[PDB]
Amino acid sequence: DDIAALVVDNGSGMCKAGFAGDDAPRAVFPSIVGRPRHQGVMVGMGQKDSYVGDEAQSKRGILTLKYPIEHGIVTNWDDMEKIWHHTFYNELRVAPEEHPVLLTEAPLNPKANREKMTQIMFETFNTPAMYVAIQAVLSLYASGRTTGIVMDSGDGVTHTVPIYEGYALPHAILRLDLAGRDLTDYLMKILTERGYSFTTTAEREIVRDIKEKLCYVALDFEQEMATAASSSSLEKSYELPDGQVITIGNERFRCPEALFQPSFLGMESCGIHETTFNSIMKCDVDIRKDLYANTVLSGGTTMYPGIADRMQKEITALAPSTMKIKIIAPPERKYSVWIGGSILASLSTFQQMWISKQEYDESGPSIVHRKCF
Amino acid sequence: DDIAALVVDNGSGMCKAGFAGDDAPRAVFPSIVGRPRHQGVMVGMGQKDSYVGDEAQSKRGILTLKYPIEHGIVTNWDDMEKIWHHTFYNELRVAPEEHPVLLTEAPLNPKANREKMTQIMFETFNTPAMYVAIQAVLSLYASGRTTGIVMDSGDGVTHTVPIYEGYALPHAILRLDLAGRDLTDYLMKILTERGYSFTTTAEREIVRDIKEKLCYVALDFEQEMATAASSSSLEKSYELPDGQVITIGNERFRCPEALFQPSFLGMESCGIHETTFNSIMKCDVDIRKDLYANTVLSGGTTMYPGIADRMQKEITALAPSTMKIKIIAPPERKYSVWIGGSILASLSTFQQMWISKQEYDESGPSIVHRKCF
Amino acid sequence: DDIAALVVDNGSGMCKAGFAGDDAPRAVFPSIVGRPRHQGVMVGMGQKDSYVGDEAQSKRGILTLKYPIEHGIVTNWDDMEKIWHHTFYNELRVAPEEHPVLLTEAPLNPKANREKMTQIMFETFNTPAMYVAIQAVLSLYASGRTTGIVMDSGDGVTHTVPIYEGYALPHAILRLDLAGRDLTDYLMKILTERGYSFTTTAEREIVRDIKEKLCYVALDFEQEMATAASSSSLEKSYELPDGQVITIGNERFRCPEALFQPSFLGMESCGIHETTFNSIMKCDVDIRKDLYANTVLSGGTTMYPGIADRMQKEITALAPSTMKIKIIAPPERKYSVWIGGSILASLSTFQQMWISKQEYDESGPSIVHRKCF
Amino acid sequence: DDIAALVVDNGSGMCKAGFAGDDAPRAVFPSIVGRPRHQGVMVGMGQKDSYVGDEAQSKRGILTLKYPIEHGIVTNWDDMEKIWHHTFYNELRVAPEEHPVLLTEAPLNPKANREKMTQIMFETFNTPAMYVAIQAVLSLYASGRTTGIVMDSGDGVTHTVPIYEGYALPHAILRLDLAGRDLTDYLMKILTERGYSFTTTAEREIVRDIKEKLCYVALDFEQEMATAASSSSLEKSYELPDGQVITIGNERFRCPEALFQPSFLGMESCGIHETTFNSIMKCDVDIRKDLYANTVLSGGTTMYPGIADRMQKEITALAPSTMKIKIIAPPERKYSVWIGGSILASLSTFQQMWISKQEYDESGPSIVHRKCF
Amino acid sequence: DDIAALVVDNGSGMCKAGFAGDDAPRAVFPSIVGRPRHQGVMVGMGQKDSYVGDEAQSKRGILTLKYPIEHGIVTNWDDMEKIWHHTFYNELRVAPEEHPVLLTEAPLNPKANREKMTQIMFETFNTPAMYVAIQAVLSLYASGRTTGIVMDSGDGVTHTVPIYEGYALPHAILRLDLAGRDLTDYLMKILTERGYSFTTTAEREIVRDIKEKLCYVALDFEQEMATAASSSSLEKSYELPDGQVITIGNERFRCPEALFQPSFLGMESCGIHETTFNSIMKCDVDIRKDLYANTVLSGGTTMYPGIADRMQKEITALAPSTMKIKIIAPPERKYSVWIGGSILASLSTFQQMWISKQEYDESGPSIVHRKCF
Amino acid sequence: QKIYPYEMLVVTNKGRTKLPPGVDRMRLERHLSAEDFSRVFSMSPEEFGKLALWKRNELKKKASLF
Ligand SMILES: Nc1ncnc2c1ncn2[C@@H]1O[C@H](COP(=O)(O)OP(=O)(O)O)[C@@H](O)[C@H]1O
Ligand SMILES: Nc1ncnc2c1ncn2[C@@H]1O[C@H](COP(=O)(O)OP(=O)(O)O)[C@@H](O)[C@H]1O
Ligand SMILES: Nc1ncnc2c1ncn2[C@@H]1O[C@H](COP(=O)(O)OP(=O)(O)O)[C@@H](O)[C@H]1O
Numbered sequence A, B, C, D, E: 001d002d003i004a005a006l007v008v009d010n011g012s013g014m015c016k017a018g019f020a021g022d023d024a025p026r027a028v029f030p031s032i033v034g035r036p037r038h039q040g041v042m043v044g045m046g047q048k049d050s051y052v053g054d055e056a057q058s059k060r061g062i063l064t065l066k067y068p069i070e071h072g073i074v075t076n077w078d079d080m081e082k083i084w085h086h087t088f089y090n091e092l093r094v095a096p097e098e099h100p101v102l103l104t105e106a107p108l109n110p111k112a113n114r115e116k117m118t119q120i121m122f123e124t125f126n127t128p129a130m131y132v133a134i135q136a137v138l139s140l141y142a143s144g145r146t147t148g149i150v151m152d153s154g155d156g157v158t159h160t161v162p163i164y165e166g167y168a169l170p171h172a173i174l175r176l177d178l179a180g181r182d183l184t185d186y187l188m189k190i191l192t193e194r195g196y197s198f199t200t201t202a203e204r205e206i207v208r209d210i211k212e213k214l215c216y217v218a219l220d221f222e223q224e225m226a227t228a229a230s231s232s233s234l235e236k237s238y239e240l241p242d243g244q245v246i247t248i249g250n251e252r253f254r255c256p257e258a259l260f261q262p263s264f265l266g267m268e269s270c271g272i273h274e275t276t277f278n279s280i281m282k283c284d285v286d287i288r289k290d291l292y293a294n295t296v297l298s299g300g301t302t303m304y305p306g307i308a309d310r311m312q313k314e315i316t317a318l319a320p321s322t323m324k325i326k327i328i329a330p331p332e333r334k335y336s337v338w339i340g341g342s343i344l345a346s347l348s349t350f351q352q353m354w355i356s357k358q359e360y361d362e363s364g365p366s367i368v369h370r371k372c373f
Numbered sequence F: 001q002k003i004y005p006y007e008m009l010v011v012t013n014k015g016r017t018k019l020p021p022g023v024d025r026m027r028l029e030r031h032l033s034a035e036d037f038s039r040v041f042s043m044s045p046e047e048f049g050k051l052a053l054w055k056r057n058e059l060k061k062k063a064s065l066f
């Protein structure tokens, strides 16, 4: 009588879903809700109010695109309900009232998000049980080690947590609001120098594709700037769906550099490397050596080429030169959080950790604070 | 079954009426009203105030011929009432008080034209229902594809509209006043240069027939001019109605070339290919690729032999070289603006979009802007 | 002793020029280049190759008008040397090789525009020193306060920038592409409803004159539509140059309303009031209170009657109600971009920040990126 | 230069030739070729085949008269060679091969006219240089201004052309076939009413001589009809060569009313005032204010008394009331087409626009279209 | 004795300064140093390298603020010199060479800090004399009694010392690094749950202002949570500088009690009441009655409402029931560390204990260890 | 002293090919022979030697050797 519990990762950018005990997610699609913005003149065709997922991406040329989740916090709840319904009924084709579900969220969040998620999922979808986990803990589960520091950077939020021997330290958890959306906006702001104008949401998707395809992190920023200014080896050509060909040139490595120096975006906060160092140094003096040797990267934002070498060099510069620094970035890091779910719902003891419907009926939507970390 | 509606296309050159559901109009006749010029010496011969439609073509010698429609705008309404009465009671022998009426209108025109047409058919004819639709939307119904750009060219108006997946773009609709009658006037002005003189309104029909029979679009202009200057193999002989024989020759292809270079008429505006390109580039970036491969020709003016190759060559020259251009020119496109109309009244969902007589009684002539596109 | 530095304001619609200490600009003229479309027929009259400035405005009938600046970017340069030569040698009668030159430009521009402007001003005109400044920064110099957010809405672009205590925030600068030329095109499109057709470039000046004479911004849009549909009190009559009289009627407040709802032209981007509010909210918390009390309007496009009250009402609706918002609109805002620039040329501490000739000789035209702004 | 060019105007009725730089033409004579009658007393004629000019006009009793010019189109070329030979040897008594020749032509003429004229001149007269000009531009030269609309009304054709600052408008040139010959034929038809009969070409000249001395244009047609029917104050008497006296009376002002009402002759076209108004309205909307104020009359047909006031009244009725209309009718207008030619050969620039012998020799007779307008 | 010695109390949070023998300090200002972080584009605006004191807090929008003292240890010395210069010259308008100075520091501090303070005070400002005191001793002087235990809680450190009849026991001196900055950080951490986000230094100052305005210590903790969760009777509204209104609510009593339970912050140390209890038990047996009856509070951190009753309850729970417990909290404890210092400078005996300039030049900067305490 | 023809050393970002082995990307115009150099830049290597760095780079950009 073993039923596969659904594992659904609702990130800021893209939504993933699958069954517990599997290796890879069954459904992966962008979390974009689109609405028409032009006049319809052909009477006879079917009318469709909203476009959800890849169907919004295919016909994005006549739609306004909105993200239901930005900066790790969901604002438009009806769009999120539509995303969940499209996930359950069109991408997995399973009855939601039969299987338990597992969801992910950022470490530091507004308190009402968990309660609203619990209320929606027991009332609208009528699930037997659910659980809300933290994405970095699942990343550490998928890493296969008990101890280490997890730096997860998604599309809306970045967070670092330290864990030693399965005991998490809550006072050293660091949350920084720098992610891929700000990088896309900065790429919009710096592509204007070459004369290319991108203004609408379809242009946002095009610029996001450009950033995904032709960006990399410089090992040395001033060396790369001098080399790019002096010659023209660092130039690549990308052609738009219209057919015009654009050349990026210098802007390939300037946009990824906003992660390490947030002064480019106007933020006064420190870089990701100094954030990790400050999170480590806030821990105890005895467990820092193990945290140096088990640094784990996660999230799609850390998918840029040359990110691990720059991270290791910066941390080695910050850290004392006796302790030996190893960075651990698996090649399939982008789905790693979801992979952690495939372990978390597969354990024998985790069947005693589900939030039953009966406990919800006793204690309202506030049971999630008592039963979830 | 319900009563089949009457599809009436009021083209500037010809008026075409027929029952909905058929594949061809049942009554096609020129939109010309003639009045007597000389005096009638014979007594008892019978008197006729005016000659409407095809009979006006029968006796061209003793008449002054006038068009109630110029440049797509109605200038005289009594002649329109005569045209509509001859269309209904004579060419079709049908009672207009038991049939819905579908009408065909230019995209951009004076707004009072729709109100006057609505007033004319709910007061004089007492029709139970009426609808008004744009020419190019019906043309793209008749093409059979939902996505494409439509260029229509008649005797009063040339217009290009883009439509993507049934959604029209109002800001990219382009209108140009270069049409068939301007080409006829230019043909008269250039045939004056060979010594042949045509001045009266009766001879304009002869010049129009000459243009319809012996004109074509050259693929290359200056090469064709050099060929026509070097040899006399392009000359053609035409027989006048009174037995005279004239020779056109070099003027065979210079008249249609005014469609592509409007500087011959003294106009400043660009050609039809530049108009189509400008209408395409006004659209969004993502939907342009489907618009370059779905260009649709319509209207009588695009019936010149060899216009498709010239249009494809010019658009391919303007377009980027990566993409391909397809020009869709049906062999029966002259009636396409009617045929899609015969489709539109046959749809089961269209019956809810009729303007009712009671609705007009409640809202007056101003209702037609709210219901129609 | 000290020699006055002439200041030149280059705009999409109008170009202004004057001296450093002058109260008012010396010469103001449209930035139009005219070329004869027709063919000269008189022998011995003599013909002029190109018409620059007000003369090109005078002979609108026989010329085709071209704007060298579109959307704040110089598209054609030979027209720009023509305009600058006409400015220096005809409207001012001053040798350009003995005076410094101050130029203004939009905030977000391609760098090639700056390098080309510097290269032309140094290589051809032999200017000893020159400087480039942002327009809306000079708007605060004209206003006389060192703290506020500036709307600058010209004929090319519309940019907002906040400056607090003399420090500018580069991440809060916004550049909407809506401007007065789009309003002229929209007035052309909506004048077709009444039956008046304006096609050629010579009639665009007439449409612009109609826009300048008989347009105003409605305080309440729906109330004004109801009033215009009820009676005919708000109807005005304009006289064409050749003698006809047209009645603008309802459209007077439908042209500039597109500034506040850019969905009329199909643009996805928000209105100008929402642009100002988003530029405010992109700044820090502690400076928003001073920025509400020092909103400054600039540019000719903000010369419509009643725009200040509408902007104040919209901002007060958007902003929190506990604090007050005042819109500071000087009656001479149209020349404010010039006037503050003159104030920039009068300070004693501005002398050593001019770009020297030998500095250009040793560092190329890229010295503007490190000396200006 | 001491070498003086010849100015030759070959009208439909009269040919006027003279030297350049003179106020009046030196020789003026009708272009009539008289051939012997088929029967009776050819004894007085000797070896000569035909008579040309005034000697053909004197011996009308034994000759049939033929006009080589038909509606401004040369039908017989041997008659034109006879006319030119008589002009060059019997009037000026100068060798054609020493002096350059300037010739005139109607605007809308066949291309073969200029080529044949140049070929005959260069082959049969050996002129070193020659030029072909257009009549109404010469009329505007003689008027002294470079802006206005010219209405030329000769003995074969009427044409209206506007000029703005020396740039002709080829799309606004209008040509109407209404001149003095049709008026002479109409006068002959209406003179049958009294009892007098004219059929012979000599009687055609008699009727033309009557029209040149007794006809005038009525200001109000119905008022003049009423005052002609009321009393006999308008009757005048003309003495025939055979000694008896005719009286015209009513129909002296009925002959020129075919100029304003061409329905009297049975043709379809409109009057000269309507033609001038339509030529004005075909221009741009900007320059019409000039063209209303600079209307220039020309031609020998426009010498009827009262034509200026009648035309001014008609155009004032047609035009909008705001504009000011003034008709320029010089007293020497009958020779204006010649007079401006005497100006055109006197300018220093025009010496560079002659057609030399070598250029004709290599280029054939097709150099006229490339060198002349 | 005629001269008045300066008294300067420079803790981590506030800096106060005044003259000896005065009941109130003359200057009180925050001890922060701000540097501009944004590009300034204004000519003639003037430049300021750093902002010190109240003017630094007045312009928090464009400033980065640094505290020169962290946990009672001077991390940066140039900022401290700037603060001392601003205190001596701008806030007091006195010459440092004419007066002695008195300085305070925490009991358990590195002696390099004291040596560097002595070297800076003698070598740069050329003060004739200087003394270094302990803050809690001066607080006991300001209390007005000789025997007592002082628990001083500043913004950087919290220290407890016992004094019996003017005799200091160094082995019972206790120090914790728990103070108001940790409470501010904890308030920032717990404000995230309600959705309010505060990240930068200006937001840190806003959070500190919120802590100063709306915070109170509950007598019973779980009863307070039950009351706050049962109803909304304990809620308050605070107005942000930008006009937003926030509701602090349940967090009001969660922030200040972290002093009592450091396990909320992750520290394993005991509370302040248990610190005082253990310091009392570290003394002798017979002196515990007077230490029980003469317990005093000091520092701004002890300015929360209801802290005295809770501290008394915890102490009388820990202590045996047979003895008397007094918690004496003066209403001006926030300046008490200053006030007693002035009393120390008012004694005729104490001015034999100045560190003279002769003694400093005699024995280097290490004389402060033997001379002071 | 590597010697190569002209337009094969012209580097187009469209092709991303046609690069010779063992040449430094920094300075390509040195390897051009003198007569081909005088074809391309219409000027001698000496007076190219006096030219400023930015002007030289602009000459490379014009000849598409940058
Ligand atoms: N291969 C890649 N290279 C660079 N950036 C990438 C790559 N893949 C994804 N990204 C960036 O990462 C973002 C997606 O992150 P994701 O892991 O979906 O975040 P979450 O799942 O937490 O929403 C995208 O916005 C994209 O810009
Ligand atoms: N076989 C043909 N060859 C060339 N031109 C044609 C031909 N048939 C029609 N035309 C042109 O098309 C025009 C008729 O167009 P029509 O479809 O009647 O216009 P509308 O769409 O206004 O009804 C005619 O004026 C003629 O110039
Ligand atoms: N004094 C006059 N009054 C009225 N009509 C005249 C007079 N003189 C000439 N005409 C008319 O002008 C005609 C001659 O026109 P003419 O000037 O020869 O034409 P063109 O301009 O082609 O040379 C004659 O047929 C005659 O009818």
Ligand SMILES: Nc1ncnc2c1ncn2[C@@H]1O[C@H](COP(=O)(O)OP(=O)(O)O)[C@@H](O)[C@H]1O
Pocket (backbone or CB within 6 Å): E010, E011, E012, E013, E014, E015, E153, E154, E155, E156, E180, E181, E208, E211, E212, E213, E215, E299, E300, E301, E303, E304, E334
């Ligand atoms: N009235 C008050 N209520 C609550 N907290 C206060 C109050 N006044 C000051 N504080 C807190 O005390 C701190 C100031 O401590 P202070 O006594 O100035 O330190 P120092 O001993 O270094 O002078 C501030 O950070 C503030 O948070």
